[PDB]
Design a binder for this molecule. Structure first.
Ligand SMILES: [Cl-]
Ligand SMILES: [Cl-]
Ligand SMILES: [Cl-]
Ligand SMILES: [Tb+3]
Ligand SMILES: [Tb+3]
Ligand SMILES: [Tb+3]
Ligand SMILES: [Tb+3]
Ligand SMILES: [Tb+3]
Ligand SMILES: [Tb+3]
Ligand SMILES: [Tb+3]
Ligand SMILES: [Tb+3]
Ligand SMILES: [Tb+3]
Ligand SMILES: [Tb+3]
Ligand SMILES: [Tb+3]
Ligand SMILES: [Tb+3]
Ligand SMILES: [Tb+3]
Ligand SMILES: [Tb+3]
Ligand SMILES: [Tb+3]
Ligand SMILES: [Tb+3]
Ligand SMILES: [Tb+3]
Lengths: 307, 303, 299, 305
């Protein structure tokens, strides 16, 4: 039962699924849906109202075509931006989406004080750093980072070791994308570190086999439906609710922070999600922390190449 | 609720995939079977919803197939397959789609509840019922969404909470679906009395027009309804498998006085057995129901 | 979810359990707790507020020592021979009703006091058009019966349907025509699988279980608290679930009487006598005549 | 959540039965063992709780026992407090024998189980059981978990803010000495001091702490015992552990505190498969009070036998 308002910037497949999740799963009361496409946010709103009627959930929804109409939002999830084309470099996408994130931030800044901005737009860590510059102290800027990569990794462990999903813990950290890495020291099954759980059950599964299965599963979703829709919508709800309901759940998110020897970079580490956000680098071992620093340097390199 | 049963989803396009997601993230169901003829589609939907179940910490089992013949021992089967034109032409093309699905599911799914979503839904319900017979229970979504869409309209126009509204849309799903105004109440007070005592100054006609304008806005923007229908499948399937005995208007093959056996929508008890309650309608609503029942039979007779 | 106020008159084991249920499961916006014992309702409220904090549920609870303090509630739950107990409890129920009647317009009154059918009629007489009066009737009996079926037939609870109807107490009867297992009539299910279990063994099992609860706990608590919550929420959220409850209705050959039949629980309450076969309707008529005999003896 | 694991409830008095009712009617757990030495007591509770499951349409499996040795393959074991039945050192010595006997009878048939201790003094009783169970499972105490939720509820009631808006921890040694970690207390992310200051609210830290104490005195005075709050906390801790939720809750957990050594103390802890105490969440001043709270617990523990 939370009396706050959550705004959705871009009500495409991911945006609309996220809005549906908020409507039917316990938690949220007020919603703001925004999309540039005329009539799209309105239609997505009317359908979700019918679904709330089914679950007998009393919700209040507003739909607009202009981002400037968003005011007094407690959480703002941004799915807007252009997808990465096969030809484009990570620098080319950063340049295209940097202006998009800047223009959205500029229109929301003054009307939404104290709001948690959740950037989904890619490259997610670089985009979080762009929105964080624009917003500053007027709110809290975060990115989804490796939050979904973490749930996809746990789901592959659960499948490969024949254990229920509830039994698996562990995090995917660093730079979201192809370079995101498993923090193997945090990976447990019913609280038993994964190396001991495997050898004690004669399981013929290696770390490389788990990592390839995650990539293969992600690629099968991309090939058949064009993008991941259901998993990311669930993760935004988990991030937003943990923040607004002060749940203090550990979730890796892209968060601007001071990284030893690298500086202020948005990178994913296991973070406490509550009223305030607290990154816990100490949950990573000395080796994993050294790899996290390389990720932060890579993120900054892309950020400093923005024209 | 927490039930140990398996639900199959035949057709994992936008609607079926939303239903599968709903099952993965809300309490109730933990076993599901996803089917789609399009290569890799059902598998893709399955891997993605498993990622959402991991977020919600819900231990579920999902299987995905490309052949409907692989569905076995399902307790409920939601059918979203078929073409999305007149009611007669749509009936002939989709009747054969439903008959084929029926023949491949019948023997390997004993006692399963079949939920026909394929349009014209009352007609497709009759088609499957003939194929399935006594080997399972066949129903259609009928006017269940129409009902919630109407309540959503009343809640918004009267500025009352959604949980305060009761009432049913009945008959033939589509343009001839009608509000059973005798059943429409606000916190147990008949709607006419509620509006008059409070000087709300809204006509039954303005509410009905509002429903149509809202429905039109959904089509022009996303092509079809998605979220509302998926929520209704969850409601129906769970009320049946958990023996909840909720009253929901659904398309049910029933004997209609002076018409015969026809699948038409009336407020129905949704439990292990399904029981239509024509007596919830007044004399005049019952005459219109007989007329809707004839209209469905006519379309059925044209296949 | 539900923006209404529910009052609980009497916060003993049952009442306090019901209050806890409303706070942690469906989520209620407002709760009013009443108990004549000084400090009792107040302490239950403080403890339940701590449970709401654990579950991160926004609830607002008020506690009183006098029934006259209950105002604007949307639902109100009211927690030797059966003839003499009727004369004694009729005055208690009339006094509670007189205190609440004009301060709680449109409220659903839920009578738990025994004899529940007779008490439902007595409170209905006081309230009249100022709210809706119902009694718990055979709602718990139905869920107790289903749990016995699930146990003896080794089937999940969710597979069982069926109703216990009539007069709450020794005379309540199973409407066996409504009893199904995954929609299969219980007689057919048992035959097809060769289960050596009789209707008589099931009815006796139900009684032995209830006697064992009284012997160990002193009273039934968890089942009743769950049942009150199910009834109140179905009425306030217009869920239209079928639950047998004591409802003042017209019975053929009897007239006005509160008796238990499978009833539609929504904004309006619709009793469904036609779910019963002819023989069950004839036993039901006998239950209604016995209730009316008791009602007529207490004005 | 939807977990396939089994939770055992040792002692099915008011608290035990309430915890078993919570598991039965809310999503998460569907398998439970109820244990009570009083003949027919656990059975009666089970039968009544099964009736509540029928109402909520939750297919659950419950087993009732009179003997503790009958508990097998439990993933979580909640040892509820017995009858209060006088002096501090003597109570700790008499209760330690009770906890040791229960531990000895559960250890071998419940490998890797989480043991939840309620029996006072909770911190010392968590250490006593930890010695018994050892590597065969994970031993925790309730510590200041409920004290934290009671403190949060008082902040909510006094400042007139939604309960969901309040963050903050009560830490140290459970009881009279339990102290508020004021540096962790926030309202929608804003520190309580700055929140109260900017809105000119006539509420001090002393008034809040006094209110929490007064409220807990009114529960004891009327109900005789806290029931609903503790039962809700067991559900929260057990589900966070069994579903690897990683919620931060202060619990009594054996750990190393410099200057003290091995001690069970309540610090904000990650509740997951593994439990990790987060002492760094407290500031320099709260950390020195905690080291002093640890010395007190360690001194009572070193007085046993
Ligand atoms: Cl729009
Ligand atoms: Cl296949
Ligand atoms: Cl059609
Ligand atoms: Tb490449
Ligand atoms: Tb690449
Ligand atoms: Tb590389
Ligand atoms: Tb080192
Ligand atoms: Tb034609
Ligand atoms: Tb035929
Ligand atoms: Tb037409
Ligand atoms: Tb008038
Ligand atoms: Tb007054
Ligand atoms: Tb007798
Ligand atoms: Tb008799
Ligand atoms: Tb006859
Ligand atoms: Tb002594
Ligand atoms: Tb003292
Ligand atoms: Tb002191
Ligand atoms: Tb000092
Ligand atoms: Tb000795």
């Amino acid at each position: 039962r939370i009396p706050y308002k959550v705004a959705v910037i871009g009500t495409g497949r991911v945006g609309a699924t996220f809005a549906y999740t908020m409507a039917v799963v316990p938690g949220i009361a007020r919603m703001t849906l925004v999309d540039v496409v005329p009539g799209l946010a309105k239609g997505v709103m009317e359908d979700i109202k019918h679904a709330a009627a089914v679950f007998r959930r009393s919700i209040t929804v507003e739909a607009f075509e202009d981002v400037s109409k968003v005011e007094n939002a407690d959480a703002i999830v941004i799915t807007a931006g252009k997808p990465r084309k096969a030809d484009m470099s990570r620098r080319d996408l950063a340049n295209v989406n940097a202006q998009i994130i800047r223009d959205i931030g500029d229109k929301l800044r003054d009307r939404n004080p104290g709001a948690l901005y959740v950037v989904v737009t890619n490259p997610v860590d670089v985009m979080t750093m762009v929105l964080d510059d624009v917003i500053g102290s007027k709110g809290t800027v975060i990115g989804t980072g490796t939050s979904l990569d973490t749930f996809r990794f746990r789901a592959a462990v659960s499948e490969l070791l024949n254990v229920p999903i509830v039994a698996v813990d562990g995090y995917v950290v660093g730079e979201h994308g192809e370079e995101a890495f498993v923090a193997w020291s945090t990976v447990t099954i019913k609280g038993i570190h994964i190396d001991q759980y495997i050898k004690e059950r004669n399981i013929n599964i290696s770390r490389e086999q788990i990592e390839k299965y995650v990539k293969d599963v992600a690629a099968s979703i991309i090939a058949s439906q064009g993008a991941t829709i259901w998993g990311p919508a669930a993760t935004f709800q988990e991030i937003v609710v943990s923040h607004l309901a002060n749940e203090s759940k550990i979730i890796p998110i892209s968060l601007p922070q001071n990284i030893e020897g690298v500086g202020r970079v948005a990178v994913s580490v296991p973070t406490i999600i509550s009223g305030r956000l607290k990154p816990l680098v100490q949950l990573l071992n000395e080796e994993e922390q050294e790899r996290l620093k390389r990720a932060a340097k890579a993120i900054r390199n892309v950020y400093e190449s923005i024209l």
